[PDB]
Amino acid sequence: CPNTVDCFVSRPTEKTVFTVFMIAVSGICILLNVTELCYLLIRYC
Amino acid sequence: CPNTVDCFVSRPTEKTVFTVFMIAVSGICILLNVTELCYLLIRYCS
Questions:
Q1: Are the Cβ atoms of A4 and B3 closer than 8 angstroms?
Q2: Which residues of B touch A5 (CB under 8 A)?
Q3: Minimal CB count within 10 Å: which of A1, A30, A33, B20?
C-alpha cells in the first residue's frame, strides 16, 4: 500500500454489539467458575 | 486526497532537458546584455 491507505470495515456497530454480548457472558462465566472453586477449596482445605 | 497520495508526472526527463536548455540560453542573454552595459558605461566613464 502506498503511504497510508484508508480502509472501511463492514458492519462495525453490529459487530461491536455482539462483541460486548460475548465478552460480558464470558466474564460472568468466569465468576460462576471462580465461586465453585472457592466452595470446593474451603471444605477440603 | 486521503493522507498522502502518490502521483506520477508525464515525460519528466524530456521536460527537464528543455528546462535546462531554456535556462542556459536565458543566462546567455543576461551576459550578452551586461556587456552592452559595460560598453555603454566605459563611454561615459572615460
A1: yes
A2: 2-3
A3: A1
Mutate to test the interface with A, among B3, B6, B7, B8 (most CBs of A within 10 A): B3
Task: Read off the amino acid at residue A30.
Answer: I
Burial class (CB in 10 A: 0-12, 13-18, 19+), A27: exposed
CB of A23 closer than 8 Å to CB of B19: no
Residues B31, B39: Cα–Cα separation, whole Å:
12
Structural biology method used: cryo-EM
* Residue type present at position A2: P
The resolution, in angstroms to one decimal, equals 2.3
Can you count the helices (H) and strands (E) in chain B?
1, 0
- d(CA B38, CA B46) in angstroms, rounded, equals 12
CB–CB of A3/B3 below 8 Å?
yes
